[PDB]
A = this chain, B = another copy of it.
Amino acid sequence: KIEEGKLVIWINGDKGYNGLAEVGKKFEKDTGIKVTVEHPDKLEEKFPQVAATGDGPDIIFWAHDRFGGYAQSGLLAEITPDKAFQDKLYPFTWDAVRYNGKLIAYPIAVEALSLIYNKDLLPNPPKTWEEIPALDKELKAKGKSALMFNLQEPYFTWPLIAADGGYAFKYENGKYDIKDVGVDNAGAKAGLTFLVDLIKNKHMNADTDYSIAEAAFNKGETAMTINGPWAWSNIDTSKVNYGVTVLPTFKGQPSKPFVGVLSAGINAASPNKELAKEFLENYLLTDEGLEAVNKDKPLGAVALKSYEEELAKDPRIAATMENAQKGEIMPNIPQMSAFWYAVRTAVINAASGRQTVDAALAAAQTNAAAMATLEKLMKAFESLKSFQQQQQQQQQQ
């Protein structure tokens, strides 16, 4: 059960586990307490499974969206750093770590989407979403394509949708307003309409999957794709002079991408916490800490005001972060799981013809509210299961 007098940390194999085992040594040769990392196949389960009963690691590394469901179930011994530490990094990052208003996890890395172009084919990109049609019939004219991305999925579509008005739930002062779902409103209407007005004017496709997004831009076709840092490696593979800058602005309004903060929280039943304190504080952070991580595997835009600043001399990194300033924190609330499906169906109909813009987005918000039910129910089942299992244990006699 737990640790006591040591310190065990979990982070995903894919992320630079090596920086930790380094700050492990930094810690080991400074306070005299042993730190190690573990990268178990999909810890997502492992953690809340045994963390709920005490045990697991003392600390954890993962995207902030999932932390909600952990903090919801009661796992993170909410953190306490002073103004000094809070001020040491970006204010909007702090908005990404609030459940019931309280702090929970320390924010580490930040991923958001950018505009990747082909300089050999395209100069000074656009800067407004309204330029791209005038681009296409100019470039499609020479046998090419203006733009392409994942139109099949919805994580990718929101950037325009939200650009004007359209949001998920409004937070309104450091929480989430469950009622104030801002889809079928001013912004979403003309947001989505634009896209249908593209596909109907042949500029975009519909069948477009993710492969086709990556594959097409990669072969010098479609000099205009939108993706995140995870494909940056697969552009040196192709070797196509790119790329990466701030997204175009629809209706003057900045495009609105989603933001996923890595960050790290602390198991409540982990007797150490104080050791996670000074360790996470001024060992893990402070250039060096992050330096050591993002070296073995880059983290992209990072929480620390000073460090993100230093490697921002990368024209790619900078642009990602600039999309974070004018973006939406991925709400950690479990309501999001629904929003996905409801919006996913709304995009499949939007330009499918099977339905219309206005009517798709209304039926979606109408359906998104109608999903809480499905959850209230899902949870009711999960509750019957936690009484029925006591009955099952009473059944063996």
Q: Which residues of A contact B (CB under 8 A)?
A: 1, 52-54, 72-75, 268-269, 341, 345, 353-356, 358-359, 361-363, 366-367, 369-371, 373-374, 376-377, 379-380, 382-384, 386-387, 390
Q: A54's closest neighbor in chain B, by CB? A: B356
> Closest Cβ of chain B: how far from A49's Cβ, in Å?
11
Copies in the assembly, this chain? 2
In the complex, 28 of the A-B residue pairs with CB atoms within 8 angstroms, ordered by the A residue number, are A53-B353, A53-B354, A53-B356, A53-B359, A54-B353, A54-B356, A73-B362, A74-B358, A74-B359, A74-B361, A74-B363, A75-B359, A268-B356, A269-B356, A269-B358, A345-B387, A345-B390, A366-B379, A366-B383, A367-B383, A370-B376, A370-B379, A370-B382, A370-B384, A371-B380, A371-B383, A374-B380, A377-B380
Give chain B nearest CB distance to A332 CB in angstroms: 15
A148 to B377, CA, bound (A): 40
Nearest CB of B to A104, in Å: 12
Q: Give the nearest-CB partner of A361 in chain B.
A: B74
Q: Which residue of B lies closest to A370 (CB)?
A: B383
Residues of B within 8 A of A345 (CB): 386-387, 390
Distance between A30 CB and nearest chain B CB, rounded to angstroms? 31
Residue of B nearest to A53 (CB): B355
Beyond the given A54-B355, A370-B376, A370-B379, please list 7 additional residue pairs across the A-B interface where CB-CB is below 8 A: A1-B353, A53-B359, A73-B366, A269-B356, A366-B382, A367-B386, A371-B383
Name the residue of chain B whose CB is nearest to the CB of A381.
B370
CB distance from A57 to the nearest CB of B (A): 15
A363:B269 contact, CB within 8 angstroms = no
Best-surrounded residue of A73, A354, A358, A384 (most CB of chain B within 10 A): A358
Q: CA separation between A361 and B268, bound complex, in Å?
A: 13
- Please measure, in the bound complex, the distance between the C-alpha atom of A355 and the C-alpha atom of B50, giving whole angstroms: 9
> Within the complex, what minimum Cβ distance (angstroms) separates A300 from chain B?
33
Complex Cα distance A54/B354, Å?
9
Complex: A78 Cα to B379 Cα, angstroms? 38
A196 to chain B, nearest CB (A): 12
For A53, the chain B residues whose CB sits under 8 A away are 353-356, 359
User: Nearest Cβ in chain B — how far from A367, in angstroms?
Assistant: 5
Neighbouring B residues of A382 by C-beta, 8 Å: 366, 370
Q: Which 9 A-B pairs have the closest CB atoms?
A: A74-B362, A370-B383, A74-B358, A370-B380, A52-B359, A374-B380, A367-B383, A53-B355, A74-B359
Q: Which residues of B contact A373 (CB under 8 A)?
A: 376, 380
Query: Nearest CB to that of A1 among chain B residues?
Result: B353
Q: Nearest-CB distance from A177 to chain B (Å)?
A: 15
In the complex the two chains form, what is the Cα distance from A29 to B383 in whole Å?
58
Smallest CB-CB separation from A368: which chain B residue? B383
Q: Is A73 touching B379 in the complex (CB atoms < 8 A)?
A: no
